[PDB]
Amino acid sequence: KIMKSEVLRVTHELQAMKDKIKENSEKIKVNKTLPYLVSNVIELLDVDPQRKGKCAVIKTSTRQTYFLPVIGLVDAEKLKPGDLVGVNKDSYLILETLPTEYDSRVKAMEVDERPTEQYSDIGGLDKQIQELVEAIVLPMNHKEKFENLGIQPPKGVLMYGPPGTGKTLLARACAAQTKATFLKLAGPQLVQMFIGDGAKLVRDAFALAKEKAPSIIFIDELDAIGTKRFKAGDREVQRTMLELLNQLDGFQPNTQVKVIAATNRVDILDPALLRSGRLDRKIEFPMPNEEARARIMQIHSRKMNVSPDVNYEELARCTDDFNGAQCKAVCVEAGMIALRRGATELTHEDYMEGILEVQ
């Protein structure tokens, strides 16, 4: 062991390095304390002919352009044309880069932490919603098993069906089970007055989904803008829409946060929406029958003082060709006039009274 006796000197040199890094690593707090302003960064690779070529183009908020190479600490998500970077008074070096927003009108579209309703609020849809509950639970907790089996969850699920069925409050009810950040987005929001806004909205959606923590982005009314016209505004929505499909087709690292979509009608079906990353999960959600409407209306009305003498035959007969949110409006209306009816207990005539009231 005489040859291994020199390792002690090496360990003393290494622990001496750990003893001497406290000062030069301690000045990181006083030099990198606070970037006083915000400056935009534009990446531009240079060539010096080590003597290697590496540079970047800087633009300050006060419209002043300077010169500086690519510097700082170990960069992994950096080197992109972003904003909100670290900068000193006049040295103009890059110390702390963090991606920034602005145009808060799109950043704060729907800031929801978690909803209140859960999946146990409906009745008679487990045979078709269980695939989605699995498709949101197993890709969140069973990421370890995805390497033994080599499974990548799909990113596009088509939640299509007739309107009024509750395709938004139910997907939100499953978003309560996702436990991730919920972020809504409307179809018509892409149609703006200025040019090129849809690119900023799409790259913003993948900017918060790509940059932020694992979240949930549910969109709706996609059919209202998914028109395949052959000037035209829906062809501009083909520029933005086909741009989004290009970001769901040309991006293999799209294994991150999913993009859930829902269409209120499948009349104008875009044929280019078929792909593993695109809307491949096509589970048909038809109009609930009087039995299913009595189930979702019973579980949605399990909180009000409902009379126990309900055979569901009269309401089952009156509810003809109705939807889920329509019976939800009947439940809410019953909870509205049942107050002014004097009797604190919900009666049986209030069902048809609400059906003929709002419809």
């Binding site: 190479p69 700082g72 006049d90 110390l95 069973h142 098993k145 390497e147 033994n148 499974i151």
Partner: protein
């Protein structure tokens, strides 16, 4: 007694030599921290532009902010890059010149930055042994092939999206056909991809409106630059689409689309090969039988065959079993594939 002390001392020496790797690896990063701290000391540089040069040693610079200045020549650099018309950089002190600043553009960063890695994808396309037509029979994977060679070399990443010929304003897209195809004629190597051409492939059977007439006019520029007065012997275009019925029979002339590659799974060896490359990282019971999966599958989609096989892995993971028997493969590829036949209209 003596023979055991050599092995025991070899074990003490082993656990003594197995602790250096936990420090000597991160000490390189710790020293790299101070290397960067010594690399961030070059600060205070500004930019400028050169318009007119009077003296060979000292010339006039034009700053971005608007005020103009005059600078000298540094003893290190030479008069090669000092010629006018090249954007350079300056310093706040003495207005010296460290190096120049090569110009660029905004979309040029997008056209010169996207790169897709992966060299095995060229050999993962399955048993598949001036323009190419990739049409849309019941079989997919054209994006995996075009992006497989494109991910292999492609010599560039000149991707042409079918949504880039929108031209919201007056339909003068000829500046973009001649601009981009003029870039293809300028750069000696060039490969062009045209994915989802069915949207811009209107058959103009009836009287088209102003929105259709401009797209068909861009198709007239395509005619005038494919079989007009301009050859395309060196450049190559890849027309990908979805339905082989509305593919502009005027453009279906064999002068442009020489061969036809039907993206399908006809051969048993191609379906078995793609099934094996998609069945790489999957684990399953020792009982293997792929001839039933390949035999029962008739005219299906490749990437959707991956989605059906992984869908059978989800059907098998519903019962949270680590091992996966091939019964759920035959019955889940069977039933789910029959659902794809139902949704194959």
């Amino acid at each position: 007694d003596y023979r055991k002390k050599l092995l025991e001392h070899k074990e003490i020496d082993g656990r003594l030599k197995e602790l250096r790797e936990q420090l000597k690896e991160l000490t390189k990063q710790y020293e790299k921290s101070e290397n960067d701290l010594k690399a961030l000391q070059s600060v205070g540089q500004i930019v400028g532009e050169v318009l007119k040069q009077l003296t060979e040693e000292k010339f006039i610079v034009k700053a971005t902010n608007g005020p103009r200045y005059v600078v000298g020549c540094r003893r290190q650099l030479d008069k090669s890059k000092l010629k006018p018309g090249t954007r350079v950089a300056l310093d706040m002190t003495t207005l010296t010149i460290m190096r120049y600043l090569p110009r660029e553009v905004d979309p040029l960063v997008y056209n010169m930055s996207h790169e897709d890695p992966g060299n095995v994808s060229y050999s993962e396309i399955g048993g598949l042994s001036k323009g190419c037509l990739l049409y849309g029979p019941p079989g997919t994977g054209k994006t995996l092939l075009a992006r497989a060679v494109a991910s292999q070399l492609d010599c560039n990443f000149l991707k042409v999206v079918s949504s880039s010929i929108v031209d919201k304003y007056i339909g003068e897209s000829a500046r973009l056909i001649r601009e981009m195809f003029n870039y293809a004629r300028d750069h000696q190597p060039c490969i062009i991809f045209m994915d989802e051409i069915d949207a811009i492939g209107g058959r103009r059977f009836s009287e088209g409106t102003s929105a259709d007439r401009e797209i068909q006019r861009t198709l007239m520029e395509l005619l005038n630059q494919m079989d007009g007065f301009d050859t395309l012997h060196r450049v190559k275009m890849i027309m990908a689409t979805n339905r082989p019925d509305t593919l502009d029979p005027a453009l279906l002339r064999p002068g442009r689309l020489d061969r036809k590659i039907h993206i399908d799974l006809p051969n048993e060896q191609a379906r078995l090969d793609i099934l094996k490359i998609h069945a790489g990282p999957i684990t399953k019971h020792g009982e293997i039988d792929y001839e039933a999966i390949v035999k029962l599958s008739d005219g299906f989609n490749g990437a959707d065959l991956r989605n059906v096989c992984t869908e059978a892995g989800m059907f098998a993971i519903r019962a949270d079993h680590d091992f996966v028997v091939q019964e759920d493969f035959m019955k889940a590829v069977r039933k789910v594939a029959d659902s794809k036949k139902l949704e194959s209209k």
